Amino acid sequence: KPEDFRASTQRPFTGEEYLKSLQDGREIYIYGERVKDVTTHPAFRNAAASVAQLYDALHKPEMQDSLCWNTDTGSGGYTHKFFRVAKSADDLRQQRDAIAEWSRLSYGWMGRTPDYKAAFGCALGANPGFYGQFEQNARNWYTRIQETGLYFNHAIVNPPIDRHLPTDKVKDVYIKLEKETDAGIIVSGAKVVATNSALTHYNMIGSSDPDFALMFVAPMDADGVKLISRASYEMVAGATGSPYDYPLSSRFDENDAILVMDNVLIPWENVLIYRDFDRCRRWTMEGGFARMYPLQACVRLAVKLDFITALLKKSLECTGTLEFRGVQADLGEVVAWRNTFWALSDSMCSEATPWVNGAYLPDHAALQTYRVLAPMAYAKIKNIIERNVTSGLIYLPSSARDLNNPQIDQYLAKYVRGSNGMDHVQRIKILKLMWDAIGSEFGGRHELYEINYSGSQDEIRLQCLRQAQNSGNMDKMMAMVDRCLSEYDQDGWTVPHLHNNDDINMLDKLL
């Protein structure tokens, strides 16, 4: 039904059609109050507008070569390239570039745009056989996500568990099967971290007692589905700031909601794994999604780092410190980190492997490496920024209102000039953009997001080790060590090309 807002079944949503499709009485709360319409509400309207621009880009002729492919469904339509299964390394490369083009429309700041779960669509379409009796649901959801550009998110972090309560009363917190009916299954529970779910069409929900081993799809307007929002940096920036003062907070805020399911009916067409510990446990390795979505996440980060790199250079242009050797070296390190994530995405595509049914998966080692390095790189870049743009960021007048009151602005024009023949309005503008990138509450949330998602530092490293072991890479490395050890022993070399040291060993003489 959300795709029925389209005037055409041969293309995805336009922006206007996407926005209309959101006016569906989804139950969203923020600041103790219910949200009437996310497309007009002061906490969500600009973020919605920003996603809508992504849908609009799909239909501009000049973009279509880089953003769009024909569908593979027979519809005669087109879609964003990452919404169709890749059948080669070069298909993955073109997808990489289509992701990048979308990400540039938010300067790398929206990390949960529709292309993130496009990979879940593709995973369903590439390996529907994985799902046994629900194979046909996988196929139909692939076709649907691909043709329409439906906006999914995944809500997947479990709610905390009070360990002093009884084991009676603590099952009620996880996503659980309440009841089986002919019209579908009824479920209750919660997932924390439903990033930008207020603006999506559906969410994927996934994980003894098989009543907990579920994976299914749930629409955002289903009765019983509710979002409890976190503070809105968009609304705070609108109420007490301005675009000039909070240029990113005001338009790219992706609210990290708690997703509550109270007694929700999930039709059988939306169920993918059902009371099935075996399939649930095997899905991360065999379902494909975990092996696919980090291509989008690495590219999105790399675009963000494109932005931060030049924003840092521009900030140092208006303080005047860019000329100093030590400042230049710090900027060069930021460049190297930026380059790194582009190169990892190159390797993802160039070393892609055939998977099933002709589908190709990006290089897996590169995905794990991206996950390990991104938190280190981001923390290090932010510290480089803060220790090089020093006071530039601290004293910035409170507000565009200061610039528009000539009684204040007269002093700003004199004492807050840019150091390269640049006027105070532009200097303040640049440095406020840098501040919103790193120090505003939005910037602080983004640091937390870049550091922690994908998981804890231990866990991403463990997953990296396990990929090396499971792929056979570690055993190949070990083969090399074992060969080295093979070539000598406590009596000397075991290979003929090397010289015994008996003729030069002086230990007998010394002792």
- Nearer to a copy of itself by Cβ, of 201 and 429: the residue is 429
184, 351, 417, 439: which one contacts a copy of itself (CB under 8 A)? 351
- Do the annotations mark residue 156 as ligand-binding? yes
Is 460 labeled as ligand-binding? no
Q: Is 325 in the site for ligand AMP (CB under 6 A)?
A: yes
End-to-end Cα separation, the chain, in angstroms? 90
List of residues 6+ apart from 318 with CB closer than 8 A: 392, 418, 419, 420, 422, 426, 427, 430, 431
Choosing from 38, 311, 316, 438, the residue that interacts with a copy of itself (CB under 8 A) is 311
Q: Does 163 bind ligand AMP (CB under 6 A)?
A: no
Query: Nearer Cβ to ligand AMP, position 34 or 466?
Result: 466
Q: How far apart, in whole angstroms, are the C-alpha atoms of residue 25 and residue 34?
A: 10
Closest separation in Å from C-beta 256 to ligand AMP:
14
Phi-psi region of 455 (alpha: psi -120 to 50; beta: other; left: phi over 0): left
Q: Is 40 annotated as a binding residue?
A: no
Query: Stretches 60-68, 123-131, 156-164, 501-509: which one binds a copy of itself (CB under 8 A)?
Result: 501-509
70: contact with ligand AMP by CB under 6 A: no
Q: Does 393 bind a copy of itself (CB under 8 A)?
A: no
Block residue for tokens 């919404």: 83
Residue 173's binding partner out of ligand AMP, a copy of itself, none, with CB under 5 to 8 Å set by partner kind: none
Q: What is the smallest separation between the CB atom of 194 and ligand AMP, expressed in angstroms? A: 17
> Which of the listed partners (ligand AMP, a copy of itself, none) does 17 bind, with a CB threshold of 5 to 8 Å by partner kind?
none
Which CB sits closer to a copy of itself, 53 or 158? 53
d(CA 82, CA 121): 9
Among 88, 140, 399, 419, binds a copy of itself (CB under 8 A): 399
If DSSP codes are grouped into helix, strand and coil, which group holds residue 410?
A: helix
Burial string for 367-398 (b: 16+ CB within 10 Å, else e) reads bbbbbbbbbebbeebbebbeebbeebbeebbe
Which two tokens mark 413?
């024009």
The HSE-up count of residue 243 (CA atoms within 13 Å, CB side) is: 2
Examine residue 501 and tell whether it contacts a copy of itself (CB under 8 A): yes
Single residue of 240, 284, 390, 452 touching a copy of itself by CB under 8 A: 240
**For 7-37, what is the HEC assignment?**
CCCCCCCCHHHHHHHCCCCCEEEECCEECCC
- DSSP three-state, residue 140: helix
The binder of a copy of itself chosen from 401, 439, 449, 455 (CB under 8 A):
401
**Residue whose CB is less far from a copy of itself, 112 or 432:** 432
Under rule CB under 8 A, residue 313 binds a copy of itself: yes
Instruction: Pick the stretch among 137-145, 240-248, 267-275, 282-290 that binds a copy of itself (CB under 8 A).
Output: 240-248
Residue whose CB is less far from a copy of itself, 126 or 305:
305
CA 472-473-474 angle, 5° bins: 90
Task: Report whether 141 contacts 193 (CB < 8 A).
Answer: no
Q: Considering only residues 76 through 115, tell me which ones interact with a copy of itself, judged by CB under 8 A.
A: 104, 107
Least Å from the CB of residue 334 to ligand AMP? 18
Site string for a copy of itself, 244-273 (x = CB under 8 A): x--x--xx----------------------
Rule CB under 6 A: is residue 456 a binding residue for ligand AMP?
A: yes
**Distance of closest approach, residue 156 Cβ to ligand AMP, in angstroms:** 12
Q: In whole angstroms, what is the distance from residue 1 CA to residue 69 CA?
A: 24
Q: Which of these segments, 65-73, 132-140, 364-372, 439-447, binds a copy of itself (CB under 8 A)?
A: 364-372
Output the smallest distance, CB 328 to ligand AMP, in A: 11
Contact call for residues 46 and 196 (beta carbons, < 8 A): no
Strand spans (E) along 3-142: 27-30, 33-34, 68-70, 78-80
List Cβ neighbours of 191 (8 Å cut-off, separation of 6 or more).
155, 156, 157, 158, 159, 175, 203, 205, 258, 259
| Size (the chain), residues | 511
Binding residues: 154-156, 195
Site of interaction with ligand AMP (CB under 6 A): 325, 455-456, 458-459
Name the binding residues for FAD. Answer: 154-156, 195
